[PDB]
């Protein structure tokens, strides 16, 4: 690790070097500064009407809430363990503040204590067969907290409903709020109460003295894609000025690479965010703030070879850099 003469000996594994050329290593050009850039957004996402709401919706008659064009403070509800059930499988929960997503899909409702575990992508249950189940491409996780002291009433909280029976199987992201009766037997009941035809809508018997399996839980599922489109909403990041003529690591709303940033001199479209070549690599980057288009050209190229004579004669050596203009070196 001192001179290129002895550095060849750690590759050839010998103390006597024959004359010729030997390939040892390659170049590694260090970047200096990090470039991050995000569009100007100052709104706050409506989190007060989701978690801090008095009443919720039902799992049978749910309504998906859309939230966009804001910034999300994910350091107060994901850091504090003020919730009963919180596990996360597909997203790392510690770094939601710098990765950016387009839109979040939230469903505010309540279920019992035996029903918060049977909601999973690909796993069946009493919710996953008749009420709600998740597809395979779900990227996100759930927030659940026990609410037996406030949601449960003495005579029974009859503001909420849930389904028991369904004639068919669910397909993902669908709502069925029909009041069609179930036919279990061979007799046609045709919507009339009778034998082998039961009413699927059932209210909640919310009482504070019940078991832990029937305790109410204020739950909300959150669905969002991760780097599938130009993003709108992410956490409180900071901006950095644009530096040119130096290859650095840039972060333009998730598009991470390493290379120089020169001006573009080709035709472009107002609905084009990046350009690619035949080798499927990023060639141009759109600026989220200014109306400028940059070019991508990487650095840290070339190989290193050592030209040496025999060690029996002398020890003066030289070094040849393969295929790199040494004006930068």
């Amino acid at each position: 690790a001192l001179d290129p003469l002895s550095e060849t000996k750690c590759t050839l594994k010998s103390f006597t070097v024959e004359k010729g050329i030997y390939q040892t290593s390659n170049f590694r050009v260090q970047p200096t500064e990090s470039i991050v850039r995000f569009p100007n957004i100052t709104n706050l996402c409506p989190f007060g009407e989701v978690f801090n709401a008095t009443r919720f919706a039902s799992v049978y008659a749910w309504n998906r809430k859309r939230i966009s064009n804001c910034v999300a403070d994910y350091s107060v509800l994901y850091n504090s363990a003020s919730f009963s059930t919180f596990k996360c499988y597909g997203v790392s929960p510690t770094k939601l503040n710098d990765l950016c997503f387009t839109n979040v899909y939230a469903d505010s409702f309540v279920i019992r204590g035996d029903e918060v575990r049977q909601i999973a992508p690909g796993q069946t249950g009493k919710i996953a067969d008749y009420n709600y189940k998740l597809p395979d491409d779900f990227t996100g996780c759930v927030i659940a907290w026990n609410s037996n002291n406030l949601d449960s009433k003495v005579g029974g909280n009859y503001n909420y409903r849930y389904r028991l029976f369904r004639k068919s199987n669910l397909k993902p992201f669908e709502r069925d709020i029909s009041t069609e009766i179930y036919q279990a037997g061979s007799k046609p009941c045709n919507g009339v109460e009778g034998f082998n035809c039961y009413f699927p809508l059932q209210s909640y018997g919310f009482q504070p003295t019940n078991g832990v399996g029937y305790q109410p839980y204020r739950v909300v599922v959150l669905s969002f894609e991760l780097l599938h489109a130009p993003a709108t909403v992410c956490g409180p990041k900071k901006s950095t000025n644009l530096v040119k003529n130096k290859c650095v690591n840039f972060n333009f709303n998730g598009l991470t690479g390493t290379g120089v940033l020169t001006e573009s001199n080709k035709k472009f479209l107002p609905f084009q965010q990046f350009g690619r070549d035949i080798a499927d690599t990023t060639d141009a980057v759109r600026d989220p703030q200014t109306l400028e288009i940059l070019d991508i050209t990487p650095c840290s190229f070339g190989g290193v070879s050592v030209i040496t004579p025999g060690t029996n004669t002398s020890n003066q050596v030289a070094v040849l850099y393969q295929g790199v203009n040494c004006t930068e070196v």
Partner: peptide
């Protein structure tokens, strides 16, 4: 007679001017 992810092309030892002299 008639790409930067580690690929490189080494130049030959005998150039086009020295082949035509042979």
């Amino acid at each position: 007679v008639t790409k930067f992810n580690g690929l490189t092309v080494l130049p030959p030892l005998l150039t086009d001017e020295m082949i035509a002299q042979y």
